[PDB]
Design a protein around this ligand. Structure first.
Ligand SMILES: Nc1nc2c(ncn2[C@@H]2O[C@H](COP(=O)(O)O)[C@@H](O)[C@H]2O)c(=O)[nH]1
Ligand SMILES: Nc1ncnc2c1ncn2[C@@H]1O[C@H](COP(=O)(O)O)[C@@H](O)[C@H]1O
Ligand SMILES: [Cl-]
Ligand SMILES: [Zn+2]
Ligand SMILES: [Zn+2]
Lengths: 78, 296, 295, 75
């Protein structure tokens, strides 16, 4: 479900040109079309739809490179 | 106490506001020689524009400044009401109240960096030529950060060279200038190092932007020990914006792709203060080589 | 408008009436005009350069609100906490209005170059015999949007200011009325001089303007740019009597409230006048004018 | 009318000596009336009555003395 929640937020904030259902778990989101400003909105969405606070050590491009990276990062937090 | 504080007597007069000072003839003479030195290193084919201290609020909104540095922005407001309304505001002030409650925003802000107005100007010319475009820009800039430290002003002069083109055009431009600027700093007898850095993006959102910027090496600074060797002051910056402004303003390179942009920024007041901190306030006592470099 | 054709070579749009980017050609002439004015600076003059903002408290104290409140630009910012600021930004993203969260700073955009000089003078105690003389410059701001090239919202001002006895200032005044005309003549400009008035606001402003015109406190050098019937003031001499001396507690050498006066050069109006008069091809400018300017 | 002006001159004139000392013929500017005080005085003469000066009489001369003001109103 956590996977699906993340995917909805990526639709909520990702600003991606191609729909989230047509994006694999392990896949380059930035190549897909995730911009800097968007990735930060997305990050804020992942903070809103759950109730967590990323450490600024994981506040980077790598944590949001892919849905799986996001899922794993979120899991590694709680 | 701040090592810089003692400079104030020869360089500045108070204007009743932290970070806003009147400049003496001594100080201005050095700012002017520094500007002339920077001009002497201008690359061929560089278009020079000078901007006023204000710019379009709509342009600045479009450029994304609000998302990134809303805390630093100075907006222009005025008394835009009727004669009766204005007279009343003035009368409230006469009676111990606040006339500023009658202010409303104008369509202008104080410019936070000299390069912002150049991007729409470049965009208005159509696709870029091969090799891109280079500009020499300057403006008096404003950032709302009141401080008593002489190296942290609210109103300050910025001089920039700006490159708009392909990623290769821009990255080579930034490398040429990083080397050239260090050579200039050495000629001026300054002590410095160059290090990666990041802009002071606001809020939690901004911590991520700052992280990515540092990680992607989008910003170098030339840092000079002024207040201390442990916390040196950035007196120049070397900035790569990737396609951020090219995309925002619809600038197309000669290959039809969204243009990249970058800039080299010289903080004129910071450099002048650095010179005085480094060599003292008596110009005839400056090293002969430094005097020669500046045409003194 | 007759000046409009100059825009192509001198200015680029910045998306706001009266606020333009300046080309290298334009700035080269602004700089030569500034150097020329400097070459006429009188003995014993102290040069100060002011930023484009000044203390709101100083300007309030100066009386600016009793004269020109409609022309003032105040600096305002987002002063709240991270959450408050974020809320304002969010409203902008939402298509609402972020500016409702603006609050005034302690700064305004400087309306004229001379204002900051008076408290600086006052801080030094009583004036020496003969008074004090200053050379000041600032980027100034007037809230009056216009499409005409001689009516800008942001423009450069250069002033020589005299602070002293009534005789000190009147001597300075006579000198600069002559020198300003000699400078305009050397620049090859056509002009007349007349007494005029500042654009004081409102009905009280009508009385102020009348008094100023009747007392001949304001002299302007007027250059026909768009027409001979509506010429443009490019230099002025302003006699303030003891207004600023009293306001700031400045004492002359006799212990009386000091008089002040200033000659003001509108650098952007003068540059536009030069291009209107001589054209945008510097090589064709009159030999004597090129020589005067050091071209 | 004279009593109506003495209160105004005391209210907005801002002279260093009380309005009960001025003698209706004495120059108000030599008395200590400044320009910006004088415009506040003008505005007060328009408010205590229901009249608006023509810009012809809107000047230094019409507010030189207390007798100068009184004469101007009736006209
Ligand atoms: N470009 C420009 N110059 C101005 C403007 N207002 C005043 N100036 C210049 O500044 C001088 C001084 O202005 P003043 O103090 O007399 O209003 C004027 O004589 C004129 O040369 C303006 O709106 N635009
Ligand atoms: N508050 C300030 N006071 C003085 N100079 C400044 C200030 N902020 C920035 N600068 C100068 O402007 C340059 C460019 O600024 P930035 O856009 O922050 O990289 C810096 O490298 C400094 O030299
Ligand atoms: Cl001007
Ligand atoms: Zn820049
Ligand atoms: Zn002045």
């Amino acid at each position: 479900h956590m996977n699906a929640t993340i995917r909805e937020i990526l639709a909520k904030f990702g600003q991606l040109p191609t729909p989230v259902d047509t994006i694999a778990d392990e896949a380059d989101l930035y190549a897909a079309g995730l911009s800097s400003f968007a990735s930060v909105q997305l990050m804020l969405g992942i903070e809103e739809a759950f109730d967590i606070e990323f450490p600024d050590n994981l506040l980077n491009r790598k944590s949001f490179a892919s849905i799986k990276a996001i899922e794993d990062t979120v899991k590694l937090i709680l | 106490a701040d090592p810089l504080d003692h400079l104030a007597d020869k360089l500045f007069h108070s204007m009743g506001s932290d970070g806003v000072y009147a400049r003496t003839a001594l100080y201005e003479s050095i700012v002017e020689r520094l500007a002339a030195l920077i001009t002497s290193h201008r690359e061929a084919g560089t278009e020079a524009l000078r901007f006023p201290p204000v710019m379009s609020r709509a342009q600045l909104e479009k450029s994304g400044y609000l998302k990134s540095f809303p805390n630093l922005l100075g907006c222009v407001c005025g008394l835009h009401g009727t004669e009766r309304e204005i007279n009343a505001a003035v009368s409230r002030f006469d009676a111990g109240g606040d006339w500023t409650t009658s202010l409303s925003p104008a369509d202008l802000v104080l410019s936070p960096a000299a390069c912002y107005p150049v991007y729409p100007i470049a965009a208005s010319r159509g696709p870029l030529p091969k090799g891109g475009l280079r500009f020499d820009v300057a403006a008096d800039c404003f950032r709302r950060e009141p401080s008593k430290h002489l190296d942290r002003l609210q109103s300050f002069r910025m001089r920039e060279y700006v490159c708009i083109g392909t990623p290769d055009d821009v990255s080579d431009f930034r490398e040429r200038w990083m080397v050239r600027a260090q050579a200039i700093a050495r000629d001026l007898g300054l002590t410095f190092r160059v290090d990666y850095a990041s802009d002071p993006f606001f809020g939690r959102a901004g911590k991520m932007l700052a992280n990515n910027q540092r990680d992607q090496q989008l910003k170098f600074e030339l840092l000079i020990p002024l207040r201390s060797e442990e916390q040196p002051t950035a007196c120049m910056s070397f900035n790569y914006h990737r396609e951020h402004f090219g995309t925002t303003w619809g600038i197309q390179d000669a290959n039809g792709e969204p243009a990249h942009t970058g800039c080299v920024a010289f903080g004129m007041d910071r450099l002048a203060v650095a010179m005085f901190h480094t060599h003292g306030t008596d110009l005839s006592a400056w090293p002969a080589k430094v005097r020669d470099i500046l045409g003194l």
